[PDB]
Amino acid sequence: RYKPDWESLREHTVPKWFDKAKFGIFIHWGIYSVPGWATPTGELGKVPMDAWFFQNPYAEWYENSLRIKESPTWEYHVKTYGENFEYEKFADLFTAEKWDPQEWADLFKKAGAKYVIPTTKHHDGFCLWGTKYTDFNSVKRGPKRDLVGDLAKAVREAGLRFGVYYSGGLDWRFTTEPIRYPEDLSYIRPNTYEYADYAYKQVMELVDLYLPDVLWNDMGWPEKGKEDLKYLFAYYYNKHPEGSVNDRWGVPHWDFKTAEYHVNYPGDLPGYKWEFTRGIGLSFGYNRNEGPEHMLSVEQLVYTLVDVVSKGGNLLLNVGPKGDGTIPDLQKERLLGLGEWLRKYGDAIYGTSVWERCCAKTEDGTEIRFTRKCNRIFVIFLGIPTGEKIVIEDLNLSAGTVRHFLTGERLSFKNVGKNLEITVPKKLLETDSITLVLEAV
Amino acid sequence: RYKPDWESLREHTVPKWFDKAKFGIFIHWGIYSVPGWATPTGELGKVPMDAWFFQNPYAEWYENSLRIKESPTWEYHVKTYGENFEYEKFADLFTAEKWDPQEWADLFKKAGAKYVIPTTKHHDGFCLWGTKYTDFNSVKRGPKRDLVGDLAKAVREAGLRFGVYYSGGLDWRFTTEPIRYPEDLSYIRPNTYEYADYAYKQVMELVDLYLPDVLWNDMGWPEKGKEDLKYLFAYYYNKHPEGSVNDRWGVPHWDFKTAEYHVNYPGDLPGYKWEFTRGIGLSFGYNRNEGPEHMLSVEQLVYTLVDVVSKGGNLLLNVGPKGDGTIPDLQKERLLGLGEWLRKYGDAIYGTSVWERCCAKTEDGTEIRFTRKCNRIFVIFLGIPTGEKIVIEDLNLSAGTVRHFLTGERLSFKNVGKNLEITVPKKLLETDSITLVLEAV
Amino acid sequence: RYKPDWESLREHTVPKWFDKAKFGIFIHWGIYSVPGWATPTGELGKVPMDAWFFQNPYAEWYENSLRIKESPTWEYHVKTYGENFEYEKFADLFTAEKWDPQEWADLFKKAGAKYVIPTTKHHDGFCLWGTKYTDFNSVKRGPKRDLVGDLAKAVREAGLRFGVYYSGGLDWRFTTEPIRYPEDLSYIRPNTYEYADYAYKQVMELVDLYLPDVLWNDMGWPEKGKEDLKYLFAYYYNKHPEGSVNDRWGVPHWDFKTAEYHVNYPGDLPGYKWEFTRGIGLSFGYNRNEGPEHMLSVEQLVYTLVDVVSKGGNLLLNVGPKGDGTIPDLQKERLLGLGEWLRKYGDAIYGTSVWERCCAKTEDGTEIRFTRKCNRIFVIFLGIPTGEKIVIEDLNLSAGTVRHFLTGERLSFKNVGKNLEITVPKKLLETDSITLVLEAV
Amino acid sequence: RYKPDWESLREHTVPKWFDKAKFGIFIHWGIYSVPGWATPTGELGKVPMDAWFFQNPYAEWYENSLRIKESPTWEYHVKTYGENFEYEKFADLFTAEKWDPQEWADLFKKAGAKYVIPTTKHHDGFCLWGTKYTDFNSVKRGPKRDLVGDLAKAVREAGLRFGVYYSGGLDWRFTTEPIRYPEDLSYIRPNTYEYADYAYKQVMELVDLYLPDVLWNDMGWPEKGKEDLKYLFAYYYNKHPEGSVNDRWGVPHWDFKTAEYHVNYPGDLPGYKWEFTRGIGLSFGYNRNEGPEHMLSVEQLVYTLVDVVSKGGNLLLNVGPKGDGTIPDLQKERLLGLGEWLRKYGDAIYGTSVWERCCAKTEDGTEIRFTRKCNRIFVIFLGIPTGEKIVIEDLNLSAGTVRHFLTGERLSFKNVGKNLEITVPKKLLETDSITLVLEAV
Ligand SMILES: C[C@@H]1N[C@H](CNC(=O)CCc2c[nH]c3ccccc23)[C@@H](O)[C@H](O)[C@@H]1O
Ligand SMILES: C[C@@H]1N[C@H](CNC(=O)CCc2c[nH]c3ccccc23)[C@@H](O)[C@H](O)[C@@H]1O
Ligand SMILES: C[C@@H]1N[C@H](CNC(=O)CCc2c[nH]c3ccccc23)[C@@H](O)[C@H](O)[C@@H]1O
Ligand SMILES: C[C@@H]1N[C@H](CNC(=O)CCc2c[nH]c3ccccc23)[C@@H](O)[C@H](O)[C@@H]1O
């Protein structure tokens, strides 16, 4: 099997299904979904961190914001719900009246996602499964139902892989002071041995009850429980070798790394498996304030996915559900948009590998991304060029045959100097959707 | 802010209010106050430690003594309350029927104390605030009241600073064997991780509920929780920079050091801020056995305070209240005595700093202590000399002007050799109270 | 006293009573005794460990076996009790209806045991004393009685020493996955800080409530609680210097080492005090499947005891009681057999010490073991030789006088070369029981 | 770039060149090559370790064996060199008079090897480069030449990759006692801070002087120096990203695992990149006592390489040169035979990947091994079947087209039941060399 030690765990690497998958759905759903409110300030990495917690665009961070008197959230809360209204009271209002996990799994499958990962416990400590280590869970409060297990059955029934998100680094049920500055994160944590046991038992429980395909931890792991992971990871891998874990544990082992909005985004091939995550908007949890102005457009999403895939990554796109379990129309439509694109071009995404390079551009300034499948080379343009004459800068090919992807039509090309020229018959160009895609063999 | 690490915490030093304060009241009040009984054996540091726990003069140590069969306390307990009478039963008898925190704060202010610090939890583990981590507290038992919070409101309303005493190193609710020898202290402790979390959460709770001006720990901090202090101290300092902590945590940081009775008392300037603590008698908790024979006399107290202050310290004089919340007459009168002296001579104590030297004496053997305030030098005699001719040994002055403190009267002096001679007109001498005080400018 | 540190604890060594004792009774009694079933596969150390947990001969391991679907135990359980029948349900069926601790102590004393040690808590976590740290104990469930305390009173009343067995390394009340391979033991453990506190408090409790003569730990001590032993061992030794601990804590200190079936058995003098343990059969807990085919025969037992004693050890023979508290006839008879032998030859066992060598044999192949008592040398044959002429190989004696043990009869001997010859008059030989024993002076 | 900590080093994985190389040459050459002597007892993993160090088949362990008095090596030394001839004296005999690195590089290339790894310093502590950290090296002694350096130029000129072997775990220049049993290894080591520094500094120096392609450490890394490896690996990877390190350091990071003779040899696909190492005979260092009986045949070597390769490993075949720098005829001839088979079947070995499974066998028991290149599946028979009808037990194929690798000839086949049947005309079977190779698309 695997032995509880880093040298040994190192023998386990990102499983094939995950590398081949390329696209997954993240779900931040919780009692924060009820107030479903945040100031849509901007993207993490571009909003200054001395103001970020005070005008937090992450709506799942509502309680932390609510603990900061006079901050937009405090303002909003008191005026909408009042002061005699504690954050926890939202667990009772959290009723998932319209929820149907099969509908969700159908939606994510249609969107082309090959795996799904919900928040089983977010920073506020509310648990979406009937854990036996707390009564602040979806079985005893609000939904009166094992959201995690029920969704796992649906997803798996649809043929998708199922993972779990857990906030091991933060649990506000163990702290009183909110996070006001990034520096606060170094001391405002549970900090106790009790919390380390708790996190450990809760993840062991998720493993025993649902044997997830991915262990997606967040905000690091309690310093006192770090050595525990040697055991937990061995326990997990020995019951499920195709399982996997991310890089937010702060220990030697991890199967694939992560990046959030701008934070840790690679500009070129990074050299290890990784995964990109972001919201359809600026929040993970639902934000009734966000208008389309804040969300990506189907095209941006397709471009986001290609840039990610060309660099060896998986896109973990987040969906932010309403307290009643429905998925906001704006998010549903973009998901489908993406699903439509993937239905046409999926063969140049799923099962692919990185090429010698990820990137290129045309004389005219259109960005190009590359992907490979044995001897095939997908050339994906982030847009559809206007003219039939395309000039790719700094690129030569020895392939000899270059087809227009969707139609299969052999095309004319030649390496003119340090560039590459191809003529893409407008009949064909007009045929593509959001991306001109060519296959070089 | 401050970062959770020793290098960083080092940036925080004893706040000015504390250095300027010079005098505070300690309060050891608890269910031990009910039996209010101890053998007044002698002072810590002069009674031999192979007999000390067997005839403990610290009445707040009643339960530890009671656990030693056949020891004066066992003897006394069985004959007064009987064997079917567990120590814990005192939490029910602890009713504070006559307690009025405003009266206390009035008394301490009149006594000239600038800060007050009660035991929130002593070695027996009984808590004087409605902590949420145990039901063995004053809110659920006996007083049916938040003694800590109510006293903090009173003290602060009187304009005094408020601190907290916590027995982090010992809690007998987690041990069964009593301490019989000083060696027992190295292994007879809670010792568990559970206790370390407990202590941590309880002090965090005191910080969140009352934001004390001083964190006065006792008997060291649980070895498993030591690293926790980096976080707790940063958390505390970041919510309250003028706060402070003592030196009984056993970690790198501390704001001022401590000394108890003879233990760690400095003979001369120590070179860091420190604080002296002792009972009006030989016990901290009330001891109905102590007669005036065991207590200091107003004069001794005044001398104690001057010796302390001259050496850069603060005197933390303990008051040992009765189970019914009243302050025993013997202690009240001495407190007032001291208050009277401070009303006359306070200007040569509060706000002062140490001088080149702390000490001197006269040809006749009267001890002299020094204190400074910019260009002024207070010369405080521990007594009032008989003759108008005073000879101070081994002292010269370049000041040129030396006034009799209370009256302001310029006096005649000259440096005769290696000594200093001053003539203090008996009109003036007769005017002083417990101390002849001169001001040199 | 003893200080909580290894250097200091080292000052404590195996007490005299224990070295002089030579024989003790082990008792594995628990709710596992109810199903009282195991496949009698063979001896630990000879059955291959890749099959051992799947056909475990240790019946007290029933629950671990029951957690392995389709294993003889699963098979058996479902067919006898059914699937809707959890292992814990056995705590209710565990009623000790026929139990009489005085009868037990009488039996063990008659068997010649000088000390007794029951399992207070085995791997399944069920406790046989009214611990205050769990309700899964004999006081709240099944027997409705403090088995540990009641047995300690009986044993001590019979004049025997009393010890305690505790499963510190394993507690299945904190794990879900069974042990399938020896490798699983390195990660399938409680692993939490909570468990370390628990084990610590439970052993401290056994010490405070019964002050055992031996602390017999099993399966190592929780890694997070190892440093705790410095304190626990000092606490124990300071209340009971004649107490003792075994070697299954995984820390620097231990008073005597252990060996189980073939595991760690010494072939010759080891050089430190140790103790041998095994079942009358192949299991510790009762196994209604075992027939005499699986048990040792009185003679084998006597030989087992002599081989152990000659090598400086104590034999800790286990008795496996029924759920109703009675001792199975097969075990009772062997115990008595042994008791009978010890009544005749005890003087060449109790109070003895090892000699220059432990072993020898005759020209004919009869094994011989040696033991000492000052100037006396017991020569114990594992059998009774046929002829009056005995030839011991590779042995000479300078003693001059060699008596036939039981009768006292001086015998004729001489050192012929590298061997030793003695003539044992058949009158005498016919007089011995399972062993020819000679005394050389 | 890479940072100095396990988590970041995790990002580095086995370089593509290494994974594709499949075959390398190990060279154990040292002053131990002069005596060039050993008892050819057997293969590691097959010889009992209670005898192993006493009849050591690893001629490079000569000094260790010489230290064990009365051992075949000791007897042999005294008669050949004399009792007054210290092992270190061999450094003066080690002259490499007939050495020609280009000649070696060539032989290795003609042999089919893609990288070479020489012992820069084996257990005896003598270094084959002008290290500045010791005078016991080839520059100041014996050859008065930088063997490591000159060999690196030559191997690289031949266009092969160059790695280094280093004995971090052992250095007999720091010990006096010999290794007698595996156990001895737990304490007979340098053990000093000094040695940990020596080792770090020397590998650093190897990295600076030669930037090797592989850092192949042996016998673990000194405990006191383990943390230095985070720094050394980061430094190394930052200077040479495509470099690699083995698994014998005893720390979390490694790019590929190792197996030695029987020790750690995978029965099937292991899940990680590894490499098999062994001598052509039973020794790494040259052994004049080995005749062909002790060596592999060209066929066995081929089978070896195929089996290793089909399981995702590399074969690191050892060559043991003579003190004069020549390669023994027996060894050279085996290398060349392997080179010829690879010249012929290289395509089914180099740059391949594992397939669904590594193994299969014919109805009549010929072992079959698999490899792949994109859609091409190579089918390697360890030997050439006598008849034209071949039956592969338990293998069905979907490919529709199965050619004869050497010729390209399309062959007739059909999945019959759970086996696969194929007709290979004898004209082709008569053309293969040691293996019948089929190609399935
Ligand atoms: C997927 C998202 N992960 C967030 C945690 N993010 C990180 O640790 C990424 C880097 C980062 C540094 N400081 C931060 C403050 C807030 C959010 C992210 C970060 C969570 O705070 C958020 O609720 C959501 O679950
Ligand atoms: C202010 C007083 N502090 C005491 C603890 N004192 C100390 O740690 C000072 C030094 C000392 C060493 N061994 C001791 C035993 C008993 C009391 C004091 C000490 C407490 O035991 C006592 O109840 C009271 O709260
Ligand atoms: C006296 C017996 N001790 C056993 C634990 N034994 C040991 O740790 C000895 C060595 C050993 C190694 N692996 C094992 C697996 C099962 C039992 C023993 C061992 C227990 O498992 C058993 O229930 C019984 O209490
Ligand atoms: C390539 C070879 N590596 C050997 C070290 N091998 C190992 O550490 C793994 C196999 C092994 C385990 N215990 C051993 C004891 C002696 C030799 C080998 C081993 C070296 O001892 C040998 O000189 C040669 O360099």
Coordinates of N, CA, C and O and ligand atoms in Angstrom, one line a residue, chain B residues 26 28 44 49 52-53 56 58 60-61 119 122-123 165 170 182 185 216 218-219 248 260 263 277 284, ligand 2:
Chain B
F26 N -4.3 43.8 44.4 CA -4.4 42.4 44.0 C -5.6 41.9 44.8 O -5.8 42.3 46.0
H28 N -7.4 38.2 45.9 CA -7.5 36.8 45.9 C -8.8 36.5 46.6 O -8.9 36.6 47.8
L44 N 7.0 33.5 52.6 CA 7.6 32.6 51.6 C 9.0 33.0 51.4 O 9.3 34.2 51.2
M49 N 10.9 24.9 52.7 CA 10.0 24.3 51.7 C 9.7 22.8 51.9 O 8.9 22.2 51.2
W52 N 6.6 23.7 54.2 CA 5.7 24.7 53.7 C 4.3 24.2 53.2 O 3.3 24.8 53.6
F53 N 4.2 23.1 52.4 CA 2.9 22.7 51.9 C 2.1 22.0 53.0 O 0.9 21.9 52.8
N56 N 0.8 25.4 55.1 CA 0.7 26.4 54.2 C 0.1 27.7 54.7 O -1.1 27.7 55.2
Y58 N -0.7 30.2 52.8 CA -1.5 30.7 51.7 C -2.9 30.0 51.9 O -3.0 28.9 51.5
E60 N -5.6 30.6 50.2 CA -6.2 30.2 49.0 C -5.8 28.8 48.5 O -6.3 28.2 47.6
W61 N -4.7 28.2 49.2 CA -4.3 26.9 49.0 C -5.0 25.9 49.8 O -4.6 24.7 49.9
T119 N -8.3 37.7 41.0 CA -8.0 36.4 40.6 C -9.3 36.0 39.8 O -10.4 35.9 40.3
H122 N -8.3 30.8 40.2 CA -7.1 30.4 41.0 C -6.8 28.9 40.9 O -7.5 28.2 40.1
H123 N -5.8 28.4 41.6 CA -5.4 27.0 41.5 C -6.5 26.0 41.6 O -6.4 24.9 41.0
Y165 N -5.9 38.2 36.8 CA -5.0 37.1 37.3 C -5.7 35.8 36.9 O -6.9 35.7 36.9
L170 N -1.6 26.0 37.1 CA -2.2 25.0 38.0 C -3.7 25.1 37.9 O -4.2 26.2 37.9
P182 N 8.1 20.9 46.8 CA 8.3 21.7 45.6 C 8.6 20.8 44.4 O 8.1 21.1 43.3
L185 N 5.7 19.8 41.9 CA 5.2 20.8 40.8 C 5.7 20.5 39.4 O 5.1 20.9 38.4
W216 N -2.1 38.9 34.1 CA -1.3 38.4 35.1 C -1.4 36.9 35.3 O -2.3 36.3 36.0
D218 N -0.2 32.9 36.4 CA 0.6 32.4 37.5 C 0.9 30.9 37.3 O 0.3 30.1 36.6
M219 N 2.1 30.5 37.9 CA 2.6 29.2 37.9 C 3.1 28.6 36.6 O 3.1 27.4 36.5
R248 N 5.2 35.2 34.2 CA 5.0 33.9 34.7 C 4.4 32.9 33.7 O 3.7 32.0 34.1
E260 N 7.7 37.8 44.8 CA 6.7 37.4 45.8 C 7.4 37.2 47.2 O 8.2 36.2 47.3
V263 N 11.0 35.8 47.6 CA 11.4 35.2 46.3 C 11.5 36.2 45.1 O 10.6 36.9 44.8
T277 N 4.8 41.7 44.9 CA 3.5 41.4 45.4 C 3.7 40.6 46.7 O 4.8 39.9 46.8
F284 N -2.7 35.2 50.7 CA -3.3 36.1 49.7 C -4.8 36.0 50.0 O -5.4 37.0 50.4
Ligands
LIG2 C1 0.3 35.5 44.2 C2 0.5 34.0 44.7 N1 1.2 33.3 43.7 C3 1.5 31.9 44.1 C4 2.4 31.2 43.1 N2 3.7 31.7 43.4 C5 4.8 31.5 42.7 O1 4.9 30.8 41.7 C6 6.1 32.2 43.3 C7 7.3 31.3 43.6 C8 7.0 30.0 44.3 C9 7.7 28.9 44.2 N3 7.1 27.9 44.8 C10 6.0 28.3 45.3 C11 5.0 27.6 46.0 C12 3.8 28.3 46.4 C13 3.7 29.7 46.2 C14 4.7 30.3 45.5 C15 5.9 29.6 45.1 C16 0.1 31.1 44.3 O2 0.4 29.8 44.8 C17 -0.7 31.9 45.4 O3 -2.0 31.3 45.6 C18 -0.9 33.4 45.0 O4 -1.8 33.4 44.0

